[PDB]
Design a protein around this nucleic acid. Structure first.
Ligand SMILES: Nc1ncnc2c1ncn2[C@@H]1O[C@H](COP(=O)(O)OP(=O)(O)OP(O)(O)=S)[C@@H](O)[C@H]1O
Ligand SMILES: [Mg+2]
Lengths: 327, 164
RNA sequence: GGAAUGGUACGGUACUUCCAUUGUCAUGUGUAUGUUGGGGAUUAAACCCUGAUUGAGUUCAGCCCACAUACUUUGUUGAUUGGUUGUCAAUCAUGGCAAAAGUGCACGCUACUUUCC
């Protein structure tokens, strides 16, 4: 229709929601309105994490775009702290020092009111194992099973970040929702996609054809990282290349001859190959530079040809990295 | 710890020395004290189910490979970076080890680089001496090579990397 | 601030269902013919190559697929004697069962939004 619409998100009611998309397109609008809606219901204060410190000196105008939502009551900021009719609204700090905070009492939380949790092609900002950092954040904003409901929100859809495959978060382009125990993967309506992208086509025609590029398309639809042709089949296990601690094997199916890189196990006790000394112990055999091109002659040739086929994205990435290592 | 270079243990609750003492506090109750909080919030139960929380109770580092020695005949000798490594053989299973052994008979003593030059040792040809030690080469390729240290492990492994 | 009288998440129900799902158990390598049965393979076609057909272009036909049997190794690592088969496992896929999936929740407020009280 018109704008970002959190109704279904609020409806299906995960204790922890997980939405993605709409870069600046109201992905923050409704979710910054909602804490003040809880305040008009007179609920609890919210917690605002920030990625870094300078990002804080300018952001005191957080309620400007929610006045046109709720003109009625007083929505202001005294400084660092947010005040609704003078009552405390948001505990607002970047990441650097949450540990010093974690001994404080945090009895009142309402909702997760941050977005751009993860930025595409941005890991200089990142902190090592920040997934467990969010774990510490959540347990230092938990008192019981209630008062809390969380969201993630990345600008675009990817399948490579650790959080997803750590939770096997798999996107679906045919259907909007992907459901798990507590994890949802979603996107606004494909019909709403048509309406809003057509709205952008209307007006600034250059800003429409820029969306005609996949550059602005992938930000909201999230068709990314599916690059190589990929399949699977029922062949016999033949070879396995232990690299940096992986039980990768090769299925070779002669009928419609293609090599499928699916993962499996048989008690071969032979033909298992290691390209590094760290993965070598006293039951497998080491292979120097060239001898891969000869013993894995089928592998080498099928890679040079189009005959090599793949199964999974993680396998694809690690195998291409190996293909870079093999010289 | 990286400075003081401590060597504690999980078993010893107190780890006492001439000067230092590492104490691990209330280990069971700690764990139990955390258990109960997942009862106060099942989503924290899912958080505990995350392998990140349980993997900081798990340490990782490089580990040894083999700790082996023989009681029979032995032939070669090699030296590198001012440190000598002997060569041990055994007819029973024909096994091959590399353990500290000095032979004052001192035949065929070798180095890779002339930084350890002496009138006795000879600067080894890059790969022909490898074929001379064909059994040693094959033992590296197969599992017939075993050692008795992780320090010998690393020295031998860097030599192998320089070997080709 | 009150509903659970909007769609609703789930549980743990029922009505239709599909071991897709984890387990529980039986199955596996190769030619030789058959219309095996069906799908002519059907751009017609022009010509040719091959293989039966009979005086003779006269006839028809050349593709795949599961089965019936003898030629054989469920694949695969091991225990076996001096050495070869056969006895205990593996994973691979198949098939049958549960347990599991769709339809109402008509079993509830563990529950958000939801417009009104
Ligand atoms: N309910 C709404 N009413 C009006 N405009 C809305 C509404 N929901 C979304 N929008 C649109 O969203 C815009 C602002 O949304 P944002 O808060 O910027 O979302 P965003 O995707 O987080 O972008 P950033 O990076 O956070 S600024 C407005 O200018 C509107 O165009
Ligand atoms: Mg935002």
């Amino acid at each position: 229709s018109l704008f970002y619409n959190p109704q279904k998100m609020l409806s299906y009611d995960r204790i922890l929601n997980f939405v993605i998309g709409a870069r600046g397109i109201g992905k923050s609008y409704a979710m910054k309105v909602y804490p003040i809606n809880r305040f008009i219901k007179y609920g609890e204060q919210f917690i605002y994490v920030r990625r870094y410190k300078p990002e804080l000196a300018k952001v005191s105008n957080y309620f400007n775009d929610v006045a046109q939502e709720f003109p009625d009551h007083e929505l202001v900021v005294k400084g660092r702290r947010f005040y609704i009719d003078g009552k405390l609204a948001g505990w607002a700090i970047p990441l650097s020092v949450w540990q010093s905070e974690k001994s404080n009492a945090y009895p009142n939380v309402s909702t997760i009111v941050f977005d751009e949790f993860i930025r595409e092609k941005d890991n200089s900002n990142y902190i090592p194992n920040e997934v467990s950092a969010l774990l510490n954040l959540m347990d230092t904003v938990f008192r019981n099973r209630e008062r809390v409901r969380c969201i993630c929100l990345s600008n675009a859809v990817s399948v490579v970040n650790p959080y997803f495959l750590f939770f096997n978060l798999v996107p679906d382009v045919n259907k909007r929702f992907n459901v798990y125990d507590d994890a949802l993967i979603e996107i606004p309506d494909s019909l709403d996609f048509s309406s809003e992208r057509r709205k952008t086509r209307f007006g600034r025609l250059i800003d429409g054809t820029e969306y005609g590029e996949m550059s602005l398309d992938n930000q909201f639809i999230g068709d990314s990282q599916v690059f190589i042709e990929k399949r699977s089949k029922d062949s016999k296990f033949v070879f396995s290349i232990v690299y940096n601690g992986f039980t990768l094997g090769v299925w070779v199916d002669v009928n419609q001859g293609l090599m499928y890189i699916d993962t499996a196990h048989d008690p071969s006790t032979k033909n298992v190959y290691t390209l590094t000394t760290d993965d070598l112990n006293e039951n497998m055999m080491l292979i120097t530079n060239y001898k891969n091109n000869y013993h894995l002659r089928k592998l080498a040739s099928a890679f040079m040809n189009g005959y090599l086929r793949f199964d999974n994205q993680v396998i694809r990435n690690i195998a291409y990295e190996l293909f870079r290592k093999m010289r």
